[PDB]
Symmetry: C5
Subunit: 334 residues, 5 copies
Amino acid sequence: KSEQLLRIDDHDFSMRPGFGGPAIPVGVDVQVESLDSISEVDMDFTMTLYLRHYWKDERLSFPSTNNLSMTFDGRLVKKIWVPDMFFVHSKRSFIHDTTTDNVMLRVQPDGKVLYSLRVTVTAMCNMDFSRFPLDTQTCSLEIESYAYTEDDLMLYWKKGNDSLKTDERISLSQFLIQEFHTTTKLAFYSSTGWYNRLYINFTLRRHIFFFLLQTYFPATLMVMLSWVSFWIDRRAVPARVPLGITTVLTMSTIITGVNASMPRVSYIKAVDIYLWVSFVFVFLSVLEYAAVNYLTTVQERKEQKDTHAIDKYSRIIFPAAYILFNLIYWSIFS
Amino acid sequence: KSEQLLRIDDHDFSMRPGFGGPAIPVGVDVQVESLDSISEVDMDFTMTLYLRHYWKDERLSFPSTNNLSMTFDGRLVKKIWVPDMFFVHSKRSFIHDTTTDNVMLRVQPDGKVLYSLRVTVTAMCNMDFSRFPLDTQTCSLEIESYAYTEDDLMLYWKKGNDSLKTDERISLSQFLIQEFHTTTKLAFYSSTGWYNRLYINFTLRRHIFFFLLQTYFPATLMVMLSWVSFWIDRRAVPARVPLGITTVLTMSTIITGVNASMPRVSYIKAVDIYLWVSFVFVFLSVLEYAAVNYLTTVQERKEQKDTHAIDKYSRIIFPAAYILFNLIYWSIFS
Amino acid sequence: KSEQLLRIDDHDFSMRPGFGGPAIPVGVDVQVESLDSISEVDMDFTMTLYLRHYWKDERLSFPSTNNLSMTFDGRLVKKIWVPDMFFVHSKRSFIHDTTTDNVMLRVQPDGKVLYSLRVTVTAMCNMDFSRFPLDTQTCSLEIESYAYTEDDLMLYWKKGNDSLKTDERISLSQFLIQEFHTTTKLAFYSSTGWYNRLYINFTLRRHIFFFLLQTYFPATLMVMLSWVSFWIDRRAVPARVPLGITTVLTMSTIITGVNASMPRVSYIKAVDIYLWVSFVFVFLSVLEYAAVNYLTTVQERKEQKDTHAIDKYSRIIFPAAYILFNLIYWSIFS
Amino acid sequence: KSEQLLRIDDHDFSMRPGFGGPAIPVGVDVQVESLDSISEVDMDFTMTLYLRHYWKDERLSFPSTNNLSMTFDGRLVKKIWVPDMFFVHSKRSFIHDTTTDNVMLRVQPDGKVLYSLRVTVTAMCNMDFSRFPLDTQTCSLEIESYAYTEDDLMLYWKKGNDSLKTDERISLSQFLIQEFHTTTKLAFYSSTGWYNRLYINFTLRRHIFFFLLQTYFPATLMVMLSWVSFWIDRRAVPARVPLGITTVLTMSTIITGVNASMPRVSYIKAVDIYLWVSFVFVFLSVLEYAAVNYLTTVQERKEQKDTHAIDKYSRIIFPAAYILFNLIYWSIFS
Amino acid sequence: KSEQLLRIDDHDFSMRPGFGGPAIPVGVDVQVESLDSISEVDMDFTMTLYLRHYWKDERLSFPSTNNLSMTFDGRLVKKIWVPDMFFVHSKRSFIHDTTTDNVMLRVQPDGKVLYSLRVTVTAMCNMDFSRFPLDTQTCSLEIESYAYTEDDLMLYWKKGNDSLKTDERISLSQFLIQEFHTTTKLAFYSSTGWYNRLYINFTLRRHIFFFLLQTYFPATLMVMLSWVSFWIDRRAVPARVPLGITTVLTMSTIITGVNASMPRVSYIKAVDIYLWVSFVFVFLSVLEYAAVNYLTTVQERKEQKDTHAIDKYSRIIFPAAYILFNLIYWSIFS
Ligand SMILES: CCCCCCCCCCCC
Ligand SMILES: CCCCCCCCCCCC
Ligand SMILES: CCCCCCCCCCCC
Ligand SMILES: CCCCCCCCCCCC
Ligand SMILES: CCCCCCCCCCCC
Ligand SMILES: CCCCCCCCCC
Ligand SMILES: CCCCCCCCCC
Ligand SMILES: CCCCCCCCCC
Ligand SMILES: CCCCCCCCCC
Ligand SMILES: CCCCCCCCCC
Ligand SMILES: CCCCCCCCCC
Ligand SMILES: CCCCCCCCCC
Ligand SMILES: CCCCCCCCCC
Ligand SMILES: CCCCCCCCCC
Ligand SMILES: O=c1[nH]oc2c1CCNC2
Ligand SMILES: O=c1[nH]oc2c1CCNC2
Ligand SMILES: O=c1[nH]oc2c1CCNC2
Ligand SMILES: O=c1[nH]oc2c1CCNC2
Ligand SMILES: O=c1[nH]oc2c1CCNC2
Ligand SMILES: CCCCCCCC
Ligand SMILES: CCCCCCCC
Ligand SMILES: CCCCCCCC
Ligand SMILES: CCCCCCCC
Ligand SMILES: CCCCCCCC
Ligand SMILES: CCCCCC
Ligand SMILES: CCCCCC
Ligand SMILES: CCCCCC
Ligand SMILES: CCCCCC
Ligand SMILES: CCCCCC
Ligand SMILES: CCCCCC
Ligand SMILES: CCCCCC
Ligand SMILES: CCCCCC
Ligand SMILES: CCCCCC
Ligand SMILES: CCCCCC
Ligand SMILES: [Cl-]
């Protein structure tokens, strides 16, 4: 029996190696397999990875006439001591178990141990959509011991920045992923003490040109089209009025569609500001012709009893104001 | 063996400490980690937290030459007595178990015990949307013993208002969170008796300006635009009619979009009242020109065989009525 | 040991109390905690409640110098006999298990037993939407023994109509709940025999005014607006034609939006009938002016080589027909 | 002890009754309780039913002074032999377990056994939507032994067509259910051999009138309305042009709404063909007036330097072509 | 007892057959039952299949007077050694367990073993939608040993390309499936070594004509309709202006609907390019008439104090440019 070579019943495996003395160091390596999904409304992401641990335990040393190691499955875990790692700020996770539990244990003749498992985790990530669609987001995954303070267990990256590997075909449907790196920091709990915590960081970005073409282009085109009325004869009322009222209707339908396609985030964003400023511009264009028509009718009635100056001034004033607004807007939001 | 220092087999752990005598006090502390989501249609919220208990049991005292404590995992729970807490008015919950069960047990040499676990819970919360989007909501989470009356188990906050801690980056996508505090109250069951119950309370609010700009602005702009027709010559029927009919169409499309974006709550809200009053105003504007045109045609036919008074009165009457309505509406709903 | 006071190993708990003789009566009480959700497409509802049982078993009597009872958790259930209740016509259910199983057992010194558990269940409910939104629905939850006929187990409400309690803040987002009561009836299975079955009944209703304002109002307003054209001069073709064609477009957009907001039920309802009758009315209004214009052009051409009678008759005929239709419709559907 | 009357430890229950000899027959009966849901996109359905088995095993015979049978729960299943049935072409299933496992076992004194359980299953069903909404679908549920060939286990319906029962109130929200019946057929696996397979069949249909009124009616009405322009004076260009352009807009909005309400199936259906033919008809109507106006302007200019024949021919040609198309279409698709 | 014929307790089943010597070969066969679903947003697919293994183990040989084999259920798996296969790049999987675990074991008298199970798996698949809807996708499923390198376990297809079978009625709602085949490749892990990996490949395609008719047809028809204005008299301003403004509105509504029906992929696709080029064409058509009207008004005013050349040139220039664009576009994207 392979389990009789290790004196399982001759040791108490309820206690850590080296109990009573200096803390036992544990090394960690991580391989990211894929990103599964992201949720903007719930502000969280899902990931699948391999987790590996390294430490030494003299109690597991066995005699040998060569240098071959023994491999075990997950059934041996319950008979020995292993680190109790958990993910911080996580919402749900589980360990794969098809066709059997995805757990492996390797023991060297001198007592070195390797412990590996395959897991999926969902973690929180606070997001800010003030500068949408030009916004940038940063995420992290956290690992910590649940019951062991730094005085008993010392947690670190096995090989520094080289302990993190990522799959070559990791990608997201609506985001670009960049700048993976790792960090460490100490955490304090008033109940027990200080703990070591490991981090994995990365950054997310959007495709700008797609959003530009979908949103900014039609509004600008509609604003430019609203200016055509300034060059039509003021005596053609049945041409002048329905032009403006149909332009307002088109702008309203565009805004409603754009709202219907965006993530349901209930606070002001930059695109909304741009759209509503364009709406206000379209509205003022109709007000202008209203004034011009009333003034012309009053003058004709008074005379009874050429280009109007308002149109001549508007032809210059409206484009200049729109250009100034664009310049300020793109200086603020880059 | 660490478990041989505690006389597990020398005691009956089916019975509470102090059985037959005064009730055993139990203290509680809670740390909120994050809010996960909220559902307005189902009226419930989800939360993740740490739960901690404190009590004393002489049966667990062990001799020691120092003052060091022993730490245990979840496997020891089934061999001893622990409080049976549960969440009241909850829909679902579970305990995290990756990479192993998130449970810890600490025993002092004098028999003091600390019991901590990490859990996610979904709880009900009745909501009222009468004053939407200006409404405010209050929520609470409840904790109670399942089988032990106050005569056997006394439940309380360990440190009063200081027993509650919240994460510094707790936030919701579409809500603002404020005013966390704790309370206690007694509950009565006719089957068994009286029980102690603990509460955790907080308040929710919306972003007003976003809803204002999305909903109230376009309706007001359309109502103001409908008034332009009063200043156009009454002899331009092909300009007067299509203006009004297109304004009605635009208002209808706006209302349909606004309905399509709101949570599916099937009873009257304030925003609906505002929108339909604006719709009625637009409708009356078309009726006005209908009357004016019929009267003018009748007068011309009678004569055959200047500004009309109706327009002159409407130019003043319509804005005043709209202002009065706004004043009453914003006095009622603040 | 508390379990040594009951002679567990001295009895066979695979057989019911009183085996071989008259059936053992069992009493039931239910407390409804909340309604969780409802699904109109799948026609089912979800509920959370406490379930309690009462019976007597002499085998569990224990000697005592006082009149105190013993309390047990769910671990004792597997060592004794308990009733095997199940929910009929249910889709899914489960028992809460945080922080431990929500089960309690109380034994009196004379052998009386109380057995309580907390459960969530989803049950079917056939619905008929013919009279939507004026429809009414009735639901029920059913409880029955799985393996025991009335000759072995007699099931009844412990205290008649007083065995049912409901929470004071039970509510649904889109429904009103009323008229809770209980009933019993016998059921027959050809495989085994007759069984007792318990019922819990309640009724559901909608908010009428919300649906009225959302649906019936705009259609009526559009039908009334379509009548304006009868009072405009027949010589203004460019005003008469686009009015009607835009009214048809507005009505079509309204119908499409109303369809987009309703539950996806694929058979005819009353609201659809009302909407399509209004659509037909709008369509006939355009046909009327088409005829009037053709007749006027023919007469002018013949003469070449005042109010038309059709308009004068239509002004009276259309409103009367619409009023008659409304009267019949609201007499049929109340 | 009831389990001591059956010599459990005196027999090997790892082997089928009659091992080494002729195959043991097993009879099956099924009672359908309800249909839970259907998914057109994923093409599958869900069902809840009772499953019952019948066979004889001499090893379970026990002496008795009467003819009473013994009833067992699911805990005895693991101690004896039972058939290993499974559902073929299924996606997921489970056995109900509230308040305990829904399993029953009945043993006669001569060794006859009845084995019943309550289960929910989701199964695949390939669907074809070519003739939607006039299409018809056929479904089936399949049952088979997992490890036993016909040489060891013979599976059949206990009572032929009478072994299938259905609930009197089984219904689906958007479908009609009819023609339940059962069949059997042999299946071959190259790995092991031949197996018996049982079938349960039924048929599904839609409500035709609802779809007719929702889809076909508005398109026909719009096509008929487009013909009005043929009877208006050709000199009223501002009435003729906007009529046609608004009719095209209305038709486009109707088609978009109809697409938005239908199941997301990405291949051509009959309703789409009808809608796009109507669209083409509307488009040709505008082209006609374009030609008429250009020809009239050319003739007036040439003369400078009555009803047009095109309108007279169109008034007859368009309705005849539409009627012919309808006749062919409804002859093809019935 | 059947398990006493195999000397279970006389062997250590924690170690592979042939331990210490050459690697043990294992053969694999797969039968695909159905495809369950696909997700374009999450880029993954689901499948159900049977998995079978073949190998030889002398430790399981038993004496026999004939050549009959013994069949076992899943309860024997835990008492012997079996290969630890797992799926690479998978998101979730599970083994069916109704009415019991779907596992079978067959042992020949000489020690040959067959091991079969039924499983459902969801796997990742990176997709590229640049050429949508004309795009093509390739997918694969991967199988590998979790703890055994090629030096200990040799994995291969049992019968080459004949080891893969597919159901005759496998289909997807919105895709066509073709070209199933298998491949093998070696993989390297720096932690342990080299591993054998098996592949299953297939290809996906769309229905082109459906997308053509739904998307490309209406845009082309609207572009062609916008050209009608070039043939109308330039003196009919109230006919010329609203035509163009309504054509722009119709095009915008079409684009919004098309966007509302497509999978939410946030980057540029070919269909978007086609739609926005058509939009630009419609916009230029309105600009043309604006210029023509201004020039005519200026000339009339100057004279005060026939066909215009712009229309004559446009009638030829616009269709030629559109044809050239179509030719280039369909040469690029085939
Ligand atoms: C809530 C933070 C300030 C947001 C400012 C938005 C201003 C937009 C006004 C648009 C007017 C048309
Ligand atoms: C149901 C509680 C009273 C709601 C009152 C709403 C009144 C709105 C009328 C709108 C008329 C256009
Ligand atoms: C299917 C049961 C009869 C439904 C009758 C509906 C009649 C509505 C006709 C509407 C015509 C515009
Ligand atoms: C893909 C199978 C043939 C489908 C034929 C559809 C023809 C519809 C043409 C509609 C033209 C407006
Ligand atoms: C992002 C890769 C290049 C995409 C090029 C799209 C060009 C489309 C322009 C449409 C102008 C109306
Ligand atoms: C904001 C004013 C709305 C009414 C303006 C009507 C036009 C006035 C022209 C003098
Ligand atoms: C008619 C004079 C020129 C009109 C266009 C002016 C554009 C000004 C942009 C700064
Ligand atoms: C509510 C009345 C609808 C018909 C009114 C038509 C206009 C009348 C002008 C005198
Ligand atoms: C249902 C008839 C459709 C064509 C009617 C065109 C108007 C005719 C006026 C005499
Ligand atoms: C012009 C005569 C009165 C027009 C309105 C008549 C309404 C009739 C409703 C019964
Ligand atoms: C003006 C002559 C009759 C117009 C309608 C003809 C309908 C033909 C349908 C076959
Ligand atoms: C398909 C042709 C589109 C341009 C036609 C413009 C009308 C021509 C009238 C002679
Ligand atoms: C000369 C006609 C000018 C028409 C107005 C153009 C304003 C927008 C220019 C892009
Ligand atoms: C009026 C001269 C012909 C107009 C149509 C020309 C089409 C050119 C396509 C290359
Ligand atoms: O309850 C606790 N007191 O400290 C810790 C926990 C859980 C997470 N590890 C540190
Ligand atoms: O069934 C009961 N009778 O009292 C209680 C319960 C459950 C919740 N604790 C108090
Ligand atoms: O299979 C059965 N034969 O009778 C019954 C069942 C289940 C539900 N209880 C009565
Ligand atoms: O793997 C198999 N070889 O034959 C069968 C199976 C499963 C389903 N029963 C027949
Ligand atoms: O952790 C590992 N080191 O090598 C492997 C694993 C898992 C998958 N098998 C090969
Ligand atoms: C009218 C558009 C101006 C854009 C300027 C952008 C400056 C970075
Ligand atoms: C016309 C808007 C009036 C708003 C008044 C608000 C008073 C608090
Ligand atoms: C025109 C509406 C008539 C409503 C009558 C209602 C009778 C109960
Ligand atoms: C114009 C509709 C004709 C319908 C004919 C139907 C023949 C079965
Ligand atoms: C105007 C459409 C031209 C299509 C050409 C296609 C060449 C393969
Ligand atoms: C829209 C503003 C017009 C101002 C006329 C004096
Ligand atoms: C805003 C334009 C004013 C023009 C004054 C003549
Ligand atoms: C819309 C009301 C008009 C009243 C004319 C007297
Ligand atoms: C409602 C306006 C009435 C005007 C009377 C002259
Ligand atoms: C819409 C019907 C008109 C009838 C003219 C005689
Ligand atoms: C339907 C109206 C007919 C009028 C006859 C003069
Ligand atoms: C729409 C086709 C018109 C043909 C004129 C000759
Ligand atoms: C398609 C109609 C042609 C008419 C010829 C005079
Ligand atoms: C739309 C471009 C018009 C150019 C006139 C010179
Ligand atoms: C783009 C058309 C230009 C025409 C020049 C006469
Ligand atoms: Cl006009």
